[PDB]
Paper text:
We soaked the AMP crystals with both AMPPNP and 3‐HAA overnight and saw clear density for both molecules. The adenosine and ribose rings of AMPPNP in this complex overlap with their positions in the AMPPNP binary complex. The α‐ and β‐phosphates in the AMPPNP:3‐HAA ternary complex have however shifted and overlap with the β‐ and γ‐phosphates in the AMPPNP. In the AMPPNP:3‐HAA ternary complex, the γ‐phosphate salt bridges to Lys62 and Arg68. The 3‐HAA molecule binds in a pocket adjacent to the AMPPNP positioning one oxygen of the carboxylate group 3.3 Å from the α‐phosphate with an angle of attack of 167° (Ocarboxylate–Pα–Ophosphoanhydride) consistent with adenylation of the carboxylate. Thr239 hydrogen bonds to both α‐phosphate and carboxylate oxygen atoms. The hydroxyl group of 3‐HAA is hydrogen bonded to Glu235 whilst the amino group makes a hydrogen bond to N7 of the adenosine ring. The benzene ring stacks against a stretch of the main chain of Gly237 and Ser238. This complex is model for the Michealis complex of the first half (adenylation) reaction.
We reconstituted the biosynthesis of the benzoxazole moiety found in nataxazole by adding two enzymes (NatL2, NatAM), to 3‐HAA, ATP, and Mg2+. We have determined the structures of both NatL2 (homologue of BomJ) and NatAM (homologue of BomN) from the antitumor nataxazole pathway. We show NatL2 catalyzes ester not, as previously reported, amide formation; the amide is a shunt product. NatAM catalyzes benzoxazole from this ester by a mechanism that we propose involves shuttling of protons to control the fate of a hemiorthoamide intermediate.
Residue numbers in the entry:
A (entry chain B): 0 to 436
B (entry chain A): 4 to 436
The structure:
């Protein structure tokens, strides 16, 4: 290929050709991995892996290995070559570090930008994930810049950008693309309604919503689409340590970006690695210098299939069920978030049920949800019938007043972006002197 | 393309570098709805000489033109969109092409201490609509420094986590406002780390976004072991318009913008003196500004500096310069700040606040036991000696103005969860931040 050194969708015409694209990179990848303290330590007294054939024998890298190596045990280049440093979501007490060169970032930005809806200079792209240490906001911004879209840095979890300000931006800037988790898609819808705007009609320029970071059932995804006027909700799957490892096709399935990484399914019982099936997601990225990973186990429970899709992409599909869990068992029946989510989001759209939570007791499933008063009793009865029909678990279902789970102030409150002030006039509130956020 | 420090050898040469750009700048400004409307049915300004007659652009004009009244290019050419800090009710939009961003990043990167690939740069200003975080990150990337995106006002990045990062990543440079420099020092002590000794790799602290006296700046330096605190002056609408030299004065980046001092009364514009900061950026396409009044109270001087940079210096009073009549006398935040930060460093007085009553100055500050009573008496003597205003000074326990929880609280970065085990807290289901 003229003028580019990493593969694109179309560079292989068969799974045999895809496999050759991968194995060709393994000598470079294996040489780079040995340059890091962690892999140099791992292969100390022995002969290390050097060839594509040697890769079959390579030991898995666990999350706990990355935490033990905090901060730069996994670093394979001089620190002068790093562009950005990031840490994972989850526990603050046991951080996981990731870091990337400028060239590593081109691979990251390309993988995010594989959005079947496209990202164009004509787009105004609201980035509504965090920029605080996590990679998510930086990744969407970098892909927006790569493709020439106007980036509106919404951030998320920032006091500067409450939902009321994000609704105003969505409408007044004619935003065409959003990036945020699926719960944030419903929070934005609720904040729109609280501002007197219909998500299904009053945002005519909004053409797609990019999402990730949560297990997302097709039933919930299609409801999120319907709330926002039937526009595409385009899912990806990623981690701080790997970048984007799978993206949605127009048929609504996520495909693994296998041209940019070797993907394997790990069976905890047998300790075997397969190219498809049910088990834990293992990733060997092929196009990074700073933080080489050999068979890094994300420990996400996944279903990988090589079975063809209506989209015709020559890549396996992946479903992400969730993380390692004991499964929540209520008698002979096993309840998953995924199964309850399907039942909750199968309620008629007219009931406006978006916010809910459940607790597994040994004897009973406790479930609460917000619904407007008129439809609340119908919703409780219909969701009870669904649990009886699909799970047969004992349940205590409670319908709640709006503003109970998601407070009205989260949806409507505006916050001035203040700065430190030390001297105040008599009539001014000096409570904002030093704690001004 | 764009000038560098050293491309001019005299003020006459600097002025020619500026005037050479004005035809292009005046032509670009007329492409925006605002300036096309302003000069409708007239012949517009076209030449460097015509610029002397150009009408000032007020903040209120930018708010009236929200969102894209100031836009001079197709939206396809914009790279990023930003809004100012301050009032949420009346937003001020700014926006930049990729090429506009190279000018922004260059001006921020004019840090006399340098920004190098050997640096680990903690960016501790917001990324939420405001430009501040994005600007420091862009300059870090331009100069090859490892950027650690701390963000600010984010629930993901509390002070306790930022102190842990400062220490464990051997951070060499920080970017945050001056109050945040003291908040990080207080959080460091709460984490068991001495700011003046336990961060040996920290070599400079970059700061902006509030009026900063040299007495306070020198104290912030001393708290962090005597390392340079390097000030700049900027806005969302202009980018960085002035930076500190090694002598500790801010110099205007006049090669990249025409700087004028505005007298509100007469409406007259001078190249130096006391008045409101007016800026014409020279190297932007998306959002041209002709004599944009920041309405910041400034003192501009053409007096030569020991640093040898051929650029005028600027002091920013802003709001900190506006007098409150109390006793017989007029007190400014700037003057009180000098007295508060003239207390001995060993008293650890960093957090304070005052209220101007018609009759008396009410002032509170934190000081640990057992220096609190010395501090109250000494600050009272200083106010008597320097201002002679009546005062009620109260010393407070640490944790009173800046709560211990702000300094020590750790926060897991949770995601939405819908199904919980019996023993788990399900209050984090949908409100997980
Ligand atoms: N589309 C998706 N579907 C399901 N889960 C997803 C999806 N996208 C991301 N995730 C989850 O988010 C994780 C990546 O988040 P990241 O912040 O890197 O780490 P963390 O797992 O939250 N923290 P830690 O366990 O300490 O490593 C993935 O491993 C998945 O568990
Ligand atoms: N070093 C500094 N010293 C003093 N003030 C500063 C300094 N750096 C920035 N500022 C102030 O911060 C302002 C830039 O903040 P910005 O968010 O662009 O606008 P704002 O003035 O807060 N909002 P608005 O009044 O609506 O335009 C400058 O105009 C100054 O008032
Ligand atoms: N969800 C993610 C993604 O899609 C790409 C990169 C990182 C993440 C994440 O959750 O951290
Ligand atoms: N203070 C600032 C700076 O120095 C550069 C750019 C923006 C700002 C700001 O505070 O708005
Ligand atoms: Mg570096
Ligand atoms: Mg692998
Ligand atoms: Mg654009
Ligand atoms: Mg402003
Ligand atoms: Zn498909
Ligand atoms: Zn100087």
């Amino acid at each position: 290929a003229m003028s580019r050194s990493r593969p694109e969708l179309g560079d292989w015409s068969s799974p045999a050709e895809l496999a050759e694209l991968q194995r060709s990179q393994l000598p470079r990848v294996l040489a780079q991995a040995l340059r890091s303290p962690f892999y140099a330590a791992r292969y100390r007294g022995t002969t290390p892996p050097r060839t594509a054939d040697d890769f079959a024998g390579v030991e898995v890298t666990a999350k706990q290995d990355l935490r033990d190596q905090y901060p730069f045990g996994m670093l394979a280049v001089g620190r002068e070559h790093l562009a950005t440093y990031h840490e994972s979501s989850g526990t603050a007490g046991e951080p996981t570090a990731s870091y990337y060169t400028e060239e590593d970032w081109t691979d990251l930005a390309e993988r995010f930008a594989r959005k079947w809806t496209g990202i164009h200079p004509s787009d105004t792209f609201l980035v509504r994930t965090p920029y605080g240490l996590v990679i998510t906001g930086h990744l969407a911004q970098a892909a927006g810049r790569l493709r020439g879209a106007t980036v509106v840095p919404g951030d998320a979890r920032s006091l500067a950008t409450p939902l009321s300000r994000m609704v105003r931006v969505l409408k007044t800037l004619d935003v065409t693309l959003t990036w945020c988790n699926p719960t944030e898609i419903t929070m934005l819808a609720a904040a729109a309604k609280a501002a007197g705007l219909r998500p299904d009609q009053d945002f005519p320029h909004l053409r797609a919503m990019f999402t990730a970071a949560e297990p997302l059932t097709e039933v919930r995804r299609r409801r999120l689409s319907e709330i926002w006027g039937g526009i595409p909700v385009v899912e990806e799957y990623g981690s701080t340590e790997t970048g984007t490892i799978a993206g949605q096709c127009p048929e609504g399935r996520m495909h693994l970006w296998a041209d940019r990484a070797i993907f394997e399914v790990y069976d905890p019982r047998t300790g075997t690695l397969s190219e498809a099936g049910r088990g834990q997601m293992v990733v060997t990225p092929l196009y990074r210098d700073a933080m080489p990973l050999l068979r890094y186990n994300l420990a996400d429970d996944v279903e990988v299939s090589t079975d063809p899709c209506g989209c015709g992409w020559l890549l396996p599909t992946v479903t992400v069920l969730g993380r390692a869990g004991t499964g929540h068992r209520i008698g002979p029946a096993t309840v998953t978030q995924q199964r309850l989510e399907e039942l909750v989001f199968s309620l008629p759209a007219a009931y406006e049920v978006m916010f809910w939570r459940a607790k597994a007791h040994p004897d009973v499933l406790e479930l609460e949800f917000e619904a407007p008063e008129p439809v609340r009793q119908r919703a409780v009865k219909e969701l009870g019938a669904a649990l009886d029909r699909e799970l047969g678990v004992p349940h205590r279902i409670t319908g709640l007043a709006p503003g109970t789970l998601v407070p009205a102030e989260a949806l409507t409150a505006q916050r001035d972006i203040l700065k430190a002030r030390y001297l105040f006039a008599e009539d001014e509130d000096w409570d904002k002197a030093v704690m001004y956020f």
